[PDB]
Structure formats: C-alpha cells, structure tokens
C-alpha cells in the first residue's frame, strides 16, 4: 500500500514509540480456527503454524485522547468527515437526529448518520467529553494508517494481531482461555441479551468501554476480544492462507490485492446467537474508507 498524507512525519525515538507497547518475541504460534460452527465464508481455517519476527504491539486500542492529539498536530480530516456521515447502531441514535434512508443489506440495525464522526460518535449533538479513554471509533483503515504513520508505527498484520491477542495460549477459544465468563466474571465487552433488540449490559457496557477495561491477556493486551473491531494491515481473503508456503507461513502479509481490509477481535455488538465473532480466531473485513461506531484500531511497530 502507498498512502498519501498532507502532514510531515515527525521524528520520534525508540523509547517514545515503545511507550504503551509490549514486545512480542519472535517465534511460532498456531493461527486460525477449526470450530465446526465457523461460517465457511470467513475462512477461519486451516489452523496452521506461523513464524513471526519480533514486533511491538499496543496494549490498548488507540483512544479518543490520543486520536485528538494526532488531529491537533496534523489537521487530519477523517474519511467520515469527508463523506459527511458514518454508521451508528440504531439503539444509539437519539430520536430526531437526521438520518439517511440508507440500507446495509441484511443489517437494518446500522444507520447512516450525517455528521457522525470520531468526535461526535452518535451524530450531531453527541460528543466524547465523557469518553477520553475509550477507543476512537468512526476511523477508517485510511485514518488508522495515517495515525499509525504519524505515531512512528503501523497496523499489525492479521498474524501479528492474532499472536498477540492469543497471549501465549495454544489454540484457546478466547484471549484468556476457553470459557467466556470464567468464575462468573465478564472478561470482555460484547452483547448480552437478544440481538439486535435488547442489550442487557451485564458486562457493564452497552457501548464502548474504556480501552483499559477488564483484565488483560497473558501478554498484557486489553480488549483484544470485544469492545471494537480492530483494523489490520492485510487485504481480506477467505482462502489465500490455505496455501502452505513461506509467504503464507513466515511473516505472512496476506494477498497482494483485495477490496476489503481485515478486522479482528469482535465488538460490543457481537453475540453468540448472531455472528459469534468474538472468538480470537474470528475474522471479518470492511472496505478501507468505511467507518462505524464499533470499529477502531491498535498499532504495531518494528523494534
């Protein structure tokens, strides 16, 4: 990918870049999933051993306060601001807010809201005054790459994201193990109740949570499962990674071309009765200028 920016890339030291990041040593892990209920079109399989070079990865998704500092320093205008609208979940649109008639096929709970963007996540009249440490949302893949580049960083590959999110466990279902609420404790921010009609908020949140909510995984990463979908570097496919080759098993970058970029981790909207996509092997995608109230990112870096 070859992006274009209208800000210069600032000089930053290794110590500055590494703040808030954890060092993942080089090594192998078992990537992918073979849950019999996985949707074939998602391409969770095959399970395979992947070798990665050492990398750094953010403990937290990028927050509102951090994204605000980037915008203040650069004047960056997000894709949602250029388009003039972004996607908001229906339950979060205040009555009377102007909304577009737009329809996401098969997903009527998504509303296209003029004026929804990172600083006004439910549309005009909303703000982030009480969410400085929540993940930034309504950021597209382009916006994420711009932030990451300004910060001296990059997006993780899907394999880097998954190695880090698995937190040293071999083929567990979730970042922390195989049970969703071990010891009766919520470990992530997803949906509870009846999707899309009623979220009971049993885990404490019916929207985004602070980036440091819940216990971390074994490598010190927070909210890799749930909270917000997280953009990765790779172009999406369902089958490129089914080939067994150095390109797909050593520092894999995904296919060279595509139409949508990978997103990982699930969000506050995910639920077992609908998508079941908060398992660590899960994966989907979105087109790179798209944005939504449940999608953000975390950065990686080369040491």
């Amino acid at each position: 990918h070859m992006p274009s920016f209208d800000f210069d890339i600032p000089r930053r030291s290794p110590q500055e870049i590494a703040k808030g990041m954890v060092a993942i040593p080089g090594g192998t892990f078992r990537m992918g999933g073979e849950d019999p209920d996985a949707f074939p079109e998602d391409g969770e399989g095959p399970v395979r051993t992947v070798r990665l070079s050492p990398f750094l990865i953010d403990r937290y998704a990028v927050s509102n306060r951090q994204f605000a500092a980037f915008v203040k320093a650069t004047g960056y205008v997000t894709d949602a601001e250029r388009y003039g609208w972004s996607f908001v979940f229906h339950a979060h649109v205040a009555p009377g807010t102007p909304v577009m008639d737009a329809v996401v096929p098969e997903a009527p709970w998504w509303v296209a809201v003029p004026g929804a963007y990172w600083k006004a996540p439910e549309g005009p009249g909303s703000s982030i005054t009480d969410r400085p440490n929540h993940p930034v949302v309504h950021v597209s893949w382009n916006d994420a790459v711009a932030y990451a580049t300004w910060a001296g960083k990059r997006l993780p590959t899907e394999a880097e994201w998954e190695m880090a999110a698995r937190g040293g466990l071999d083929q567990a279902r979730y970042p922390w193990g195989n049970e969703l609420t071990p010891r009766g404790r919520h470990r992530c921010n997803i949906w509870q109740g009846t999707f899309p009609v009623h979220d009971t908020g049993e885990d404490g949140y019916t929207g985004t949570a602070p980036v440091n909510a819940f216990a971390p995984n074994g490598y010190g990463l927070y909210n890799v499962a749930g909270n917000v979908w997280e953009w990765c570097a790779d172009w999406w496919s369902a089958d490129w990674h089914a080939t067994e080759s150095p390109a797909t098993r050593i520092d894999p970058r995904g296919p060279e071309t595509g139409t949508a970029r990978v997103t990982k981790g699930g969000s506050f909207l995910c639920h077992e009765s609908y998508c079941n996509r908060y398992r660590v092997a899960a994966r989907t995608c979105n087109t790179p200028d798209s944005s939504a109230a449940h999608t953000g990112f975390r950065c990686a870096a080369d040491p």
Partner: peptide, 17 residues
C-alpha cells in the same frame, strides 16, 4: 445465520440504484 452474518458495514454496501 440465512446468509453469513454481517459485522462490518461498508460504505459501498448502501449504493443501489
């Protein structure tokens, strides 16, 4: 789920006519 559940709503997806 009748077709594959959708978690990522795309700007392209709403264009239709």
């Amino acid at each position: 789920x009748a077709t594959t559940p959708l978690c990522g709503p795309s700007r392209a997806s709403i264009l239709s006519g």
